[PDB]
Design a protein around this motif. Structure first.
Motif, PDB file in Angstrom:
ATOM      1  N   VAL A 188      40.937  32.053  52.840  1.00 29.01           N
ATOM      2  CA  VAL A 188      41.391  32.798  53.997  1.00 29.01           C
ATOM      3  C   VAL A 188      40.829  34.205  54.008  1.00 29.01           C
ATOM      4  O   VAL A 188      40.601  34.755  55.099  1.00 29.01           O
ATOM      5  CB  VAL A 188      42.932  32.823  54.044  1.00 29.01           C
ATOM      6  N   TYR A 189      40.610  34.812  52.855  1.00 25.87           N
ATOM      7  CA  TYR A 189      40.195  36.201  52.740  1.00 25.87           C
ATOM      8  C   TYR A 189      38.929  36.213  51.898  1.00 25.87           C
ATOM      9  O   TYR A 189      38.991  36.350  50.671  1.00 25.87           O
ATOM     10  CB  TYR A 189      41.304  37.042  52.117  1.00 25.87           C
ATOM     11  N   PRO A 190      37.763  35.995  52.517  1.00 26.55           N
ATOM     12  CA  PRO A 190      36.524  35.854  51.740  1.00 26.55           C
ATOM     13  C   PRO A 190      36.306  36.984  50.770  1.00 26.55           C
ATOM     14  O   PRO A 190      35.689  36.780  49.717  1.00 26.55           O
ATOM     15  CB  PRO A 190      35.438  35.818  52.824  1.00 26.55           C
ATOM     16  N   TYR A 191      36.814  38.175  51.079  1.00 24.32           N
ATOM     17  CA  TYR A 191      36.659  39.322  50.210  1.00 24.32           C
ATOM     18  C   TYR A 191      37.812  39.495  49.237  1.00 24.32           C
ATOM     19  O   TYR A 191      37.898  40.534  48.588  1.00 24.32           O
ATOM     20  CB  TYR A 191      36.479  40.592  51.049  1.00 24.32           C
ATOM     21  N   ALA A 192      38.675  38.498  49.062  1.00 24.00           N
ATOM     22  CA  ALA A 192      39.711  38.677  48.050  1.00 24.00           C
ATOM     23  C   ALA A 192      39.106  39.089  46.708  1.00 24.00           C
ATOM     24  O   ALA A 192      39.744  39.825  45.949  1.00 24.00           O
ATOM     25  CB  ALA A 192      40.553  37.429  47.888  1.00 24.00           C
ATOM     26  N   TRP A 193      37.873  38.654  46.408  1.00 23.08           N
ATOM     27  CA  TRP A 193      37.295  38.970  45.114  1.00 23.08           C
ATOM     28  C   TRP A 193      37.103  40.466  44.937  1.00 23.08           C
ATOM     29  O   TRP A 193      37.049  40.931  43.801  1.00 23.08           O
ATOM     30  CB  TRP A 193      35.957  38.257  44.917  1.00 23.08           C
ATOM     31  N   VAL A 194      36.971  41.227  46.026  1.00 21.88           N
ATOM     32  CA  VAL A 194      36.743  42.660  45.896  1.00 21.88           C
ATOM     33  C   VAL A 194      37.986  43.364  45.388  1.00 21.88           C
ATOM     34  O   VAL A 194      37.920  44.508  44.923  1.00 21.88           O
ATOM     35  CB  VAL A 194      36.300  43.285  47.231  1.00 21.88           C
ATOM     36  N   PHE A 195      39.122  42.704  45.479  1.00 23.83           N
ATOM     37  CA  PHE A 195      40.392  43.228  45.032  1.00 23.83           C
ATOM     38  C   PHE A 195      40.654  42.830  43.583  1.00 23.83           C
ATOM     39  O   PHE A 195      41.046  43.663  42.768  1.00 23.83           O
ATOM     40  CB  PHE A 195      41.481  42.701  45.975  1.00 23.83           C
ATOM     41  N   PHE A 196      40.399  41.578  43.235  1.00 26.40           N
ATOM     42  CA  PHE A 196      40.809  41.046  41.940  1.00 26.40           C
ATOM     43  C   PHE A 196      39.780  41.211  40.835  1.00 26.40           C
ATOM     44  O   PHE A 196      40.156  41.177  39.658  1.00 26.40           O
ATOM     45  CB  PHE A 196      41.159  39.551  42.063  1.00 26.40           C
ATOM     46  N   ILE A 197      38.491  41.273  41.152  1.00 26.67           N
ATOM     47  CA  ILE A 197      37.520  41.461  40.083  1.00 26.67           C
ATOM     48  C   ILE A 197      37.761  42.870  39.553  1.00 26.67           C
ATOM     49  O   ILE A 197      38.102  43.028  38.372  1.00 26.67           O
ATOM     50  CB  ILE A 197      36.079  41.248  40.561  1.00 26.67           C
ATOM     51  N   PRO A 198      37.654  43.906  40.391  1.00 22.42           N
ATOM     52  CA  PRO A 198      37.904  45.262  39.880  1.00 22.42           C
ATOM     53  C   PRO A 198      39.229  45.367  39.164  1.00 22.42           C
ATOM     54  O   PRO A 198      39.279  45.900  38.047  1.00 22.42           O
ATOM     55  CB  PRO A 198      37.855  46.126  41.141  1.00 22.42           C
ATOM     56  N   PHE A 199      40.299  44.827  39.758  1.00 21.19           N
ATOM     57  CA  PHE A 199      41.569  44.761  39.050  1.00 21.19           C
ATOM     58  C   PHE A 199      41.392  44.151  37.673  1.00 21.19           C
ATOM     59  O   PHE A 199      41.950  44.647  36.688  1.00 21.19           O
ATOM     60  CB  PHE A 199      42.601  43.943  39.824  1.00 21.19           C
ATOM     61  N   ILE A 200      40.658  43.045  37.582  1.00 25.38           N
ATOM     62  CA  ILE A 200      40.502  42.445  36.269  1.00 25.38           C
ATOM     63  C   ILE A 200      39.707  43.364  35.357  1.00 25.38           C
ATOM     64  O   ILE A 200      39.922  43.376  34.139  1.00 25.38           O
ATOM     65  CB  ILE A 200      39.831  41.072  36.354  1.00 25.38           C
ATOM     66  N   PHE A 201      38.754  44.115  35.911  1.00 25.23           N
ATOM     67  CA  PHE A 201      37.926  44.964  35.077  1.00 25.23           C
ATOM     68  C   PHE A 201      38.768  46.078  34.481  1.00 25.23           C
ATOM     69  O   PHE A 201      38.767  46.291  33.267  1.00 25.23           O
ATOM     70  CB  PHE A 201      36.767  45.533  35.892  1.00 25.23           C
ATOM     71  N   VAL A 202      39.518  46.786  35.330  1.00 24.04           N
ATOM     72  CA  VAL A 202      40.346  47.876  34.842  1.00 24.04           C
ATOM     73  C   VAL A 202      41.250  47.384  33.728  1.00 24.04           C
ATOM     74  O   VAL A 202      41.265  47.916  32.611  1.00 24.04           O
ATOM     75  CB  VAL A 202      41.163  48.473  35.989  1.00 24.04           C
ATOM     76  N   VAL A 203      41.997  46.336  34.008  1.00 25.64           N
ATOM     77  CA  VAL A 203      43.085  45.981  33.114  1.00 25.64           C
ATOM     78  C   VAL A 203      42.548  45.541  31.754  1.00 25.64           C
ATOM     79  O   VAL A 203      43.104  45.902  30.707  1.00 25.64           O
ATOM     80  CB  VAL A 203      43.967  44.926  33.800  1.00 25.64           C
ATOM     81  N   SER A 204      41.435  44.800  31.746  1.00 24.51           N
ATOM     82  CA  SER A 204      40.856  44.341  30.489  1.00 24.51           C
ATOM     83  C   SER A 204      40.161  45.489  29.752  1.00 24.51           C
ATOM     84  O   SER A 204      40.163  45.540  28.518  1.00 24.51           O
ATOM     85  CB  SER A 204      39.884  43.195  30.767  1.00 24.51           C
TER      86      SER A 204
END
Ligand SMILES: CCCCCCCCCCCCCC(=O)OC[C@H](COP(=O)(O)OCC[N+](C)(C)C)OC(=O)CCCCCCCCCCCCC
Ligand SMILES: CCCCCCCCCCCCCC(=O)OC[C@H](COP(=O)(O)OCC[N+](C)(C)C)OC(=O)CCCCCCCCCCCCC
Ligand SMILES: CCCCCCCCCCCCCC(=O)OC[C@H](COP(=O)(O)OCC[N+](C)(C)C)OC(=O)CCCCCCCCCCCCC
Ligand SMILES: CCCCCCCCCCCCCC(=O)OC[C@H](COP(=O)(O)OCC[N+](C)(C)C)OC(=O)CCCCCCCCCCCCC
Ligand SMILES: CCCCCCCCCCCCCC(=O)OC[C@H](COP(=O)(O)OCC[N+](C)(C)C)OC(=O)CCCCCCCCCCCCC
Ligand SMILES: CCCCCCCCCCCCCC(=O)OC[C@H](COP(=O)(O)OCC[N+](C)(C)C)OC(=O)CCCCCCCCCCCCC
Ligand SMILES: CCCCCCCCCCCCCC(=O)OC[C@H](COP(=O)(O)OCC[N+](C)(C)C)OC(=O)CCCCCCCCCCCCC
Ligand SMILES: CCCCCCCCCCCCCC(=O)OC[C@H](COP(=O)(O)OCC[N+](C)(C)C)OC(=O)CCCCCCCCCCCCC
Ligand SMILES: CCCCCCCCCCCCCC(=O)OC[C@H](COP(=O)(O)OCC[N+](C)(C)C)OC(=O)CCCCCCCCCCCCC
Ligand SMILES: CCCCCCCCCCCCCC(=O)OC[C@H](COP(=O)(O)OCC[N+](C)(C)C)OC(=O)CCCCCCCCCCCCC
Ligand SMILES: C[C@H](CCC(=O)NCCC[N+](C)(C)CCCS(=O)(=O)[O-])[C@H]1CC[C@H]2[C@@H]3[C@H](O)C[C@@H]4C[C@H](O)CC[C@]4(C)[C@H]3C[C@H](O)[C@]12C
Ligand SMILES: C[C@H](CCC(=O)NCCC[N+](C)(C)CCCS(=O)(=O)[O-])[C@H]1CC[C@H]2[C@@H]3[C@H](O)C[C@@H]4C[C@H](O)CC[C@]4(C)[C@H]3C[C@H](O)[C@]12C
Ligand SMILES: C[C@H](CCC(=O)NCCC[N+](C)(C)CCCS(=O)(=O)[O-])[C@H]1CC[C@H]2[C@@H]3[C@H](O)C[C@@H]4C[C@H](O)CC[C@]4(C)[C@H]3C[C@H](O)[C@]12C
Ligand SMILES: C[C@H](CCC(=O)NCCC[N+](C)(C)CCCS(=O)(=O)[O-])[C@H]1CC[C@H]2[C@@H]3[C@H](O)C[C@@H]4C[C@H](O)CC[C@]4(C)[C@H]3C[C@H](O)[C@]12C
Lengths: 236, 236, 236, 236
Positions: A188-204
């Motif tokens: 539904v949100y083709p750009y959802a990855w722009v939210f979760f990849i960076p989120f994953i980067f910060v947190v890890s």
């Protein structure tokens, strides 16, 4: 002040602590056994009384330990724990019935080696609090954005700030983050990855850097202490 | 230059910073609350105005801070952040409405302890850039090969360089890499494992070695500084 | 030996290396672009020729570098790589068409910073070989047992030594090890957990200990070098 | 005591150990090959005899090594291993048939480099025992609570203390902990997350702190030894 020393010599005796531990271990076995419906059908009555006995003995023990330790008792984290956990087991027979098993952690409070581990492990936490605060703020912000971005179309995962918090924690552990959450989101949100990849980067990156900074600032202190020792001899 | 000192003493005052932080925290609560449809149905109007107020105060604050700091302001990463984030919140009511929540990161820019954490965490990055470049090249190459090898038969996962990039990132986090991607791939490409196992080896080996080289090169510097200190005394 | 110096001054010139790199980057963009069917429909012909050109220039470059470096060339891991990868791109237009993209790793061989990273990363490997051998033996043994224990009833995951190897690698990365493999196994083999938990313990314990022993033996060497330095001054 | 030295010179000879290893490797190949039904249909008979031969030679070798080493043999962990593993292979042709492959670990016992790795890896364990005890208690307690909280409605995952132990181990490795366990749990127990998030926090925090304390207490010892060395020279 006679009876006081009398009790104190009991409460402080090697035997007393050993007895209590003996009960802790006994009751620990009992609580495992009470897990079997079979076992309960046959020996449930006996076990229920053994629990009552142990809980009475522990209440008595807490009472004695307070009389002996007086105020110092409630300034002592281990005794507070022992207190709170026995007290829980006192509330008359919900969640509380299950929290009675927490009394088995008294094996930690009563065994010096266990205390030391727990103290060592806990001791790192004070210095982590601001990083924890930072991350908590980070989650909070992301959770709010995720609720707004995705909660309408994906209510189970993001319909509510709390659900978003939960899902974000799941993403941080990397559990099914892509096949289970982000790929469905991206349908539904083709750009959802722009939210979760960076989120994953910060947190890890924050997690790893937290481990790195513990080791390296530890060794820096070890280095400093050593330096001073060496310098004194050279100075001398 | 009178009014200048007048403002400067405000902008630099303890109270001013404290007020702004107070607003940050206030608005942070507000943005959480605005997440509830219930809450909005009752108090949405008030909250929307509170947002406008806070955003006006922040605009005013930025303006004052620029007048006081002049050029130095735009050479300061924290102030730039504060600037960019308030500016976003200025664009008239898409994605931007959600990016307004980024203003809550001003709590980091405004709290000295937070700055220090973020600065510490960020400070490792400059030395990682070439390893990041290396890995990025590595992904790029693998992504191209994966698109060519698998994109025709598995378009969702590899039909496009960008999808392959995404999937490869997923493989790197190890999320469902086998049950979700490589085993299905192997049903058509029995040797898919020859592509993804080595890929998994490189990426995990590079990540670990990156952590190892940070700790150990850190301690080597700590060792060097200590050495010099000790040597001076011996020299002296 | 005139033409030799003539060529050598080209092959060694700053410009020559810069040109080659320029091509590497150019061709890297090209290979990304060739990933789009759209792009190919319009510019495929041009790109295919650009690949041929680049590949010719690289062949010429390798030839010159061999004439200049002579035997030393084939004793040099970077040049061997450059050689093998250009050679692949030479085989007439299977898997090899895709392996042509490996020529983009020449950006690593041609950029000194990249070399250094790769050399640093690779340098840990020699000391890991016996631990790798140990683990490989460990997998081999477990794979054989898993094939015998589970291959008849679970052929996809364990029907063959190679499938068991694959599944065991998947278990080691912890990917769906329980929901995807061991819980289904336990529906037929209630004790499957006695095989995979210990397996998981060894492999994760060996991985962590491998990281720990790298850091700590590194610092021990740093400590030793420092010690000698300090001792000399004291001796002096 | 003549024949004794005679045998001892065999048992201790370079050749003897080399022969045994040669067999280990031979039999290791054989056990891989026996994994193929094809291979067995053709050469199973030969291989079965080769196993019997190898197992006889190993029995003979153990017997000789005991005669030569006498009591010292059964005080030696490697020889005990060699003993137990050959003995398993002796029980007449269940699980034991598969445990015969464990004889391939004799390659570890017989190769000095392997011994050293295994010894190094094992050597960390003694100091971990109380942390392991702590965690085991932690699991035990949580397992009991999880059985009581969730076993009635989710018997496969928590119906029994042992199943709860298993599931909790799965949660600790983070495998499908949310999509596979806790989200389904939360459909009946909205607060299941209050049980598993904290559980996940403890277990991951304890694991990391265990790694951190190994590295840092290692370096502290390296620091101490260095200090003493430096101090002596200064003292001298
Ligand atoms: C830096 C530390 C940050 C700590 C943040 C921790 C906040 C955790 C809140 C979790 C909320 C859980 C309840 C929930 O998700 O649903 C309740 C409503 C929406 O449901 P509903 O009202 O039924 O529609 O949703 C709400 O109730 C909205 C909750 C808003 C409360 C915000 C309070 C957090 C203060 C942090 C301010 C710092 C920002 C600078
Ligand atoms: C080194 C970095 C480590 C990371 C630091 C912290 C990172 C953030 C941790 C977040 C923990 C996950 C919270 C969570 O699962 O959601 C709890 C509630 C949501 O409540 P709820 O609305 O009931 O939704 C639950 C799911 N549902 C609807 C299906 C029942 O929402 C909340 O109200 C929870 C708000 C956050 C509270 C916990 C964060 C502060 C505690 C930090 C722990 C460190 C202490 C050692
Ligand atoms: C650092 C923090 C980064 C945060 C930025 C994350 C932005 C990406 C998140 C995302 O994909 O949100 C999607 C929004 C929503 O609009 P959009 O994705 O364009 O499509 C909506 C489709 N419809 C009609 C079914 C609702 O719109 C977009 O994302 C478009 C960009
Ligand atoms: C060392 C740093 C490497 C950095 C690499 C980052 C490249 C990220 C590109 C992501 C492309 C995303 C767009 C996408 O996937 O689909 C667009 C088309 C195919 O779709 P379509 O045209 O619709 O058929 O696919 C394309 O658009 C092809 C894109 C080719 C652009 C390549 C530019 C990267 C330069 C790196 C050169 C270094 C090599 C030595
Ligand atoms: C220590 C080592 C850490 C690893 C270093 C970097 C490793 C590579 C990271 C790759 C990140 C994943 C990128 C990605 O998910 O794909 C983004 C686009 C694809 O765009 P798109 O065509 O929209 O496809 C998205 C999926 N879809 C079709 C369902 C919508 O494709 C792209 O255009 C992205 C191209 C790569 C850009 C990011 C890489 C450079 C940033 C490095 C971050 C480090 C800074 C601290
Ligand atoms: C210490 C280093 C250990 C290295 C071990 C690496 C072995 C990797 C072998 C992978 C086999 C892949 C082929 C496969 O799985 O299927 C082929 C047949 C069964 O299929 P099929 O014949 O069609 O019935 O299955 C077979 O082909 C049986 C393969 C047996 C070959 C064993 C050679 C490994 C020598 C290691 C000896 C050290 C033991 C002390
Ligand atoms: C720090 C510790 C790191 C761990 C060290 C190594 C651990 C073991 C790694 C095992 C890698 C996984 C191998 C694997 O996936 O199976 C490969 C073949 C099986 O071939 P195959 O019969 O085609 O089955 C594949 C699946 N199928 C049937 C659906 C097509 O079976 C084989 O023949 C492969 C046999 C093992 C070869 C790789 C092991 C030695 C290389 C070590 C790499 C380290 C170098 C830096
Ligand atoms: C360290 C290495 C540890 C290796 C030992 C692993 C042992 C457990 C593995 C395992 O569960 O294998 C199961 C075997 C097979 O027999 P079993 O599990 O008793 O049931 C067979 C059922 N049937 C009739 C459908 C075939 O039998 C058993 O496991 C029974 C024990
Ligand atoms: C600090 C070290 C803690 C070590 C804990 C290790 C305990 C592992 C027990 C695993 C039990 C596995 C058997 C199982 O799950 O099902 C058997 C029955 C229920 O089945 P059923 O009887 O058919 O109804 O369930 C039972 O059999 C109940 C088992 C109760 C035995 C408890 C013995 C553990 C002593 C730990 C005492 C320390 C507490 C301070
Ligand atoms: C650094 C921290 C590392 C963590 C330390 C230990 C953490 C706890 C490990 C727990 C291991 C998981 C045990 C487990 O899977 O369950 C085993 C049995 C349950 O038996 P069972 O009733 O057969 O149920 C199995 C599942 N089922 C019903 C489908 C067949 O239930 C039991 O009886 C097992 C009770 C625990 C025994 C293992 C714990 C002590 C060994 C610690 C290993 C360290 C040595 C290096
Ligand atoms: C890097 C950040 C702070 C970032 C900002 O600054 C955090 C991570 C956890 C903290 C460590 C632990 O607390 C244990 C120990 C306490 C001693 O007192 C000082 C040394 C050491 C190793 C601490 C230094 C480390 O740096 C702290 C400040
Ligand atoms: C190993 C690679 C480079 C590989 C090539 O070379 C990368 C990893 C990240 C970098 C570290 C961080 O930047 C933090 C700090 C900066 C100091 O300035 C020097 C020390 C230290 C620890 C850096 C040295 C480390 O080695 C760098 C060069
Ligand atoms: C612990 C095991 C060996 C176990 C047995 O023994 C392995 C792990 C990888 C190896 C390290 C790396 O090679 C990098 C470096 C090479 C230097 O030359 C010596 C120092 C250092 C840190 C090595 C020592 C480490 O211990 C080795 C022997
Ligand atoms: C932190 C805890 C104990 C917590 C309580 O206390 C555990 C973790 C594993 C243990 C280490 C290993 O055993 C290896 C080595 C043994 C030496 O003998 C002393 C140094 C070292 C590094 C040990 C110290 C470490 O601290 C121990 C006590």
């Amino acid at each position: 002040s006679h009876m006081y020393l009398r009790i104190t010599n009991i409460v402080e005796s090697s035997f007393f602590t050993k007895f209590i531990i003996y009960l802790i271990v006994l009751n620990g076995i009992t609580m495992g056994l009470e897990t079997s419906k079979t076992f309960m059908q046959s020996f449930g009555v006996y076990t229920t009384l053994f629990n009552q006995i142990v809980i009475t003995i522990f209440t008595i023990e807490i009472i004695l330990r307070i009389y002996v330790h007086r105020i110092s008792f409630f300034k002592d984290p281990w005794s507070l724990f022992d207190f709170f956990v026995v007290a829980i087991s006192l509330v008359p027979t919900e969640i509380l019935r299950v929290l009675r098993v927490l009394r088995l952690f008294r094996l930690v409070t009563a065994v010096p080696q266990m205390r030391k581990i727990v103290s060592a492990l806990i001791s790192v936490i004070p210095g982590m609090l601001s990083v924890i605060a930072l991350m908590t703020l980070f989650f909070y912000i992301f959770a709010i954005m995720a609720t707004q971005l995705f909660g309408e179309r994906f209510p189970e995962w993001f319909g509510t700030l709390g659900e978003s918090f939960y899902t974000l924690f799941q993403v941080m552990t990397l559990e099914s983050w892509s096949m289970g959450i982000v790929r469905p989101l991206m349908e539904v949100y083709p750009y959802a990855w722009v939210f979760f990849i960076p989120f994953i980067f910060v947190v890890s990156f924050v997690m790893i850097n937290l481990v790195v900074a513990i080791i390296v600032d530890a060794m820096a202190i070890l280095n400093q202490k050593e330096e001073q020792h060496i310098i004194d001899e050279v100075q001398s």
